[PDB]
Amino acid sequence: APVAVTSYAQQPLKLVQEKASDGDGSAELELGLRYVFGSDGVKNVPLGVSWINKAALKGIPQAEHEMGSLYLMGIGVAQSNVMAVAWYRKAAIQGYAPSQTAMGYAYEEGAGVPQDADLARYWFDKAAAQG
């Protein structure tokens, strides 16, 4: 699921935890990704959701996208197509290509939005223009 690659990739866990507590949004996202998707030694989904959410509340598009994927799949949160689109929309409107693609699939099937094939193409083509 996770498509985000933060600047704290492959950094030691102790450094990520310290910078996350200081307010570094990139470190909050990296710590949340490790708690949610990491191995059993560091896995802690409820804590990771709060760290991903803290980075997403700062407007970080990579963090807003992951919040949408959490609500879309119901990982650590109650599954919600509406809330998934709410987070995807915030990242897609900033130009984040993975969220623009997610917006396209939402309009194609009508998940969290009224089904609209032309609006699906609008968001699909927006991600295509960045390739």
Range of the domain at 45: 13-94
In a domain, 113, yes or no: no
Do 109 and 129 contact (CB within 8 A), yes or no? no
Among 99, 112, 115, 100, residue whose Cα is nearest residue 56:
99
Question: Helices 61-73 & 25-37, crossing angle to 10 degrees?
Answer: 30
Let me know if residue 24 belongs to a domain: yes
The amino acid at residue 103 is M
Helix (H) or strand (E) holding 45: helix 45-56
Radius of gyration of the chain (CA): 15
Domain presence at residue 112: no
18 inside domain: yes
The token pair that represents 102 in the structure block: 């997610």
Number of domains in the chain: 1
- 27 in any annotated domain: yes
Count of residues making up the chain: 131
What six digits make up the tokens of 6? Answer: 């933060």
**In this structure, is residue 107 part of a structural domain?**
no
Beta carbons of 100 and 127 less than 8 angstroms apart: yes
Distances (CA, A) of 44 to 5, 31, 73, 87, 128: 19, 10, 17, 22, 35
Q: What stretches of 54-114 adopt beta strand conformation (E)?
A: none
Q: Does 108 reside within a domain?
A: no
Calculated CA dihedral for residues 22, 13, 98, 58, nearest 10 degrees: -10
Would you say residue 52 lies in a domain? Answer: yes
